[PDB]
Amino acid sequence: GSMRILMVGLDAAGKTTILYKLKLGEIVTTIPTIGFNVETVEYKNISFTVWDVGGLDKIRPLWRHYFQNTQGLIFVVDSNDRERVNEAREELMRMLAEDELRDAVLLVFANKQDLPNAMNAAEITDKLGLHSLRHRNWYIQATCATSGDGLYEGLDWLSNQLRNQK
Ligand SMILES: Nc1nc2c(ncn2[C@@H]2O[C@H](COP(=O)(O)OP(=O)(O)OP(=O)(O)O)[C@@H](O)[C@H]2O)c(=O)[nH]1
Ligand SMILES: [Mg+2]
């Protein structure tokens, strides 16, 4: 068995970029993902099956098909997209309301930190209302997917949540 991780977030957030940076160590050219991409990533001797599911609004209903048995959620946010940060919050809270996910741990990637007007992790925390969450293991990590910055730190937390020993 591997650890089942669902990676979701609005379209353009950087999910597919993150998946292939994590898996392949390269920055891949993408198009908006119509279905899903999937790879198993090994980190510190723990294997994570990461489901990168398309975030275009039209296909957001399909996220629910991936909730079952999910152990960890990676919610990717475009930290430069102030106009849509409340929409990101709404989608996150709609997902967190699901009983199926009540035990899932939540890693938020505050992505695109390379952009000069990016909101930082503290700001994104406020905008997503993370501090109000109850009975939820959660962590927010500032990242730049293209440079790799912050990714392994996110994985450190996620691996620690899901593993029970060295
Ligand atoms: N500046 C900047 N751009 C990024 C970063 N991460 C991803 N991108 C760019 O953002 C755009 C969208 O990235 P994707 O990975 O396709 O986004 P997605 O979340 O998979 O989008 P959907 O497939 O629609 O769900 C691409 O042009 C990426 O190169 C980042 O850290 N900084
Ligand atoms: Mg994609």
Curated annotation (Swiss-Prot):
Coiled-coil annotated spans: none
PROSITE patterns: ARF
NCBIfam families noted in UniProt: small_GTP
PANTHER family named among the record's database cross-references: ADP RIBOSYLATION FACTOR-RELATED
Bilayer topology annotation: Lipid-anchor
Alphabetically ordered keywords of this record: Acetylation, ER-Golgi transport, Golgi apparatus, GTP-binding, Hydrolase, Lipoprotein, Membrane, Myristate, Nucleotide-binding, Protein transport, Synapse, Synaptosome, Transport
Record protein name field: ADP-ribosylation factor 1
Gene Ontology CC terms, in alphabetical order: cell leading edge; cytosol; endomembrane system; Golgi apparatus; Golgi membrane; neuron projection; postsynaptic density; protein-containing complex
Family the UniProt entry places it in: Belongs to the small GTPase superfamily. Arf family.
Chemical reaction(s) catalysed: GTP + H2O = GDP + phosphate + H(+)
Regulation: Alternates between an inactive GDP-bound form and an active GTP-bound form. Activated by guanine nucleotide-exchange factors (GEFs) and inactivated by GTPase-activating proteins (GAPs).
Protein encoded by which gene: Arf1
SMART domains per the UniProt record, alphabetical: ARF, RAB, SAR
Subunit structure: Interacts (when activated) with GGA1, GGA2 and GGA3; the interaction is required for proper subcellular location of GGA1, GGA2 and GGA3. Interacts with ARHGAP21, ASAP2, HERC1, PRKCABP, PIP5K1B, TMED2, PSCD2, TMED10 and GRIA2. Interacts with ARFGAP1, which hydrolyzes GTP and thus, regulates its function. Interacts with PI4KB in the Golgi complex. Interacts with NCS1/FREQ in the Golgi and at the plasma membrane. Interacts with PLEKHA3.
InterPro entries: Arf1-5-like (IPR045872), P-loop_NTPase (IPR027417), Small_GTP-bd (IPR005225), Small_GTPase_ARF (IPR024156), Small_GTPase_ARF/SAR (IPR006689)
Cysteine disulfide links: none
Job description of the protein: Small GTPase involved in protein trafficking between different compartments. Modulates vesicle budding and uncoating within the Golgi complex. In its GTP-bound form, triggers the recruitment of coatomer proteins to the Golgi membrane. The hydrolysis of ARF1-bound GTP, which is mediated by ARFGAPs proteins, is required for dissociation of coat proteins from Golgi membranes and vesicles.
One Pfam family matching this protein: Arf
Disruption phenotype: In intestine cells, ARF1 deletion results in a decreased number of proliferative cells as well as an increase in the number of apoptotic epithelial cells in the crypt areas. In addition, crypts from control mice survive and increase in size while isolated crypts from ARF1 knockout mice display an clear reduction in organoid-forming capacity. Loss of ARF1 in bone marrow-derived mast cells attenuates mast cell expansion.
Naturally occurring in which organism (per UniProt): Mus musculus (Mouse)
EC code: 3.6.5.2
Residues annotated as binding GTP: G9, L10, D11, A12, A13, G14, K15, T16, T17, N111, K112, Q113, D114, A145
Record's subcellular location: Golgi apparatus membrane; Synapse, Synaptosome; Postsynaptic density
GO molecular function, one term: GTPase activity
One GO biological process term: mitotic cleavage furrow ingression
